[PDB]
Amino acid sequence: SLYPPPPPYVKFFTQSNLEKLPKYKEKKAASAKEEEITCALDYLIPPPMPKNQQYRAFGSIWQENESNYQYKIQELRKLLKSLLLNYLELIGVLSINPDMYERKVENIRTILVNIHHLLNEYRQSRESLIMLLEEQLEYKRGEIREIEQVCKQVHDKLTSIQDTLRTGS
Amino acid sequence: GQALDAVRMRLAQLTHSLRRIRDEMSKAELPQWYTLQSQLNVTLSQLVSVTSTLQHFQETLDSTVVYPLPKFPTTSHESLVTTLLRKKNIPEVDEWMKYVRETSGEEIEKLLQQDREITNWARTTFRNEYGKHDFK
Amino acid sequence: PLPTRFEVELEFIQSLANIQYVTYLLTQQQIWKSPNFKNYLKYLEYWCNPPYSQCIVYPNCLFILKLLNGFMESALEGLDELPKIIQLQGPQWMNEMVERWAN
């Protein structure tokens, strides 16, 4: 069907199984002193994390104070200059002998592809943390400073009123 | 189109009667019993007329073929189109007749003719019983 | 190879986010009638803490199951209103998820 069937073990665990789970896990721990499914109550025991700390799904694999970059910068600049130079040479190829133009085209793309690699090491979450950091920091400083400004102006008004009433005495 | 027009007007008046009985039941105070009986009987006999007239003109309704308008936009009104398109019964009625058939559960044919003869015999017996005593 | 129970339970949890899946599951009588399914739903609650929460793909179901948790004391009735209510309350629920995680 369109919707896959519920998992099979879901139907094994009734309320009686839930209430008898404590004694079952106590007995299992006492006896113990891929997990084989010898009893229907085994699944409620929390599954163990794989030792390799890896998870595979759909053909793809998955697994501290914030809780020479100049070399990369100059590499990027020289790569951009070489990319412009190669673009000029490739368009010249198109001009004179376009029949073999593709011979350079993908080459240029490789440099562009390398640029993407040069982005990968530069990857930005810390920079986003920084920018959010300063925006809420400056917002709270603005709120604070307007608080002492308003309380100070109220105090100044109170002192002026006190002087006015003392003069009228 | 004439048959569907008559179906339209009769179903419209039936829906009007339903709206009526609705807005006189929605009141916090229940009216007199007799008014409720009158409304019930009128609306229910009207439903009978609806059923009979729908029975009469099945051929005209069947002959008609449903097709969306060229001017009607389905991109924006696909939800509205699907609302009227769907026809599956409400589930509770479904398991209702499923349990009904479960409870009910050449042999069947001869039971059928035995039911025929019981029906005819009972009809004749009650005709005789009515004729036995003068009711006028 | 045969996937482990981790993979199937995680995929079930992430598929619970679909409104169509929830509507289909609640359409059948015996799914809600059977206490086994709700027992499994309450068992699934323990994935809201790390490091399990680091393995999720769509955080919305995190509330949905919790919303489904509410369904055991709110009633089936309300199944029809489920798509409308999720569409209407998507903004504030996404905001509260962001507050729970992004802050």
Binding site: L2 | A12, I90 | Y24, D80, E81, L82
Partner: peptide, 25 residues
């Protein structure tokens, strides 16, 4: 003329009961 038109009694909240099953290829 027409004494009164009918009030709109649309029920979009109705969930419908369309059976879906031939999705797998």
């Amino acid at each position: 003329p027409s004494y009164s038109p009918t009030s709109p009694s649309y029920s979009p909240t109705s969930p419908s009961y369309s059976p879906t099953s031939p999705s797998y290829s």
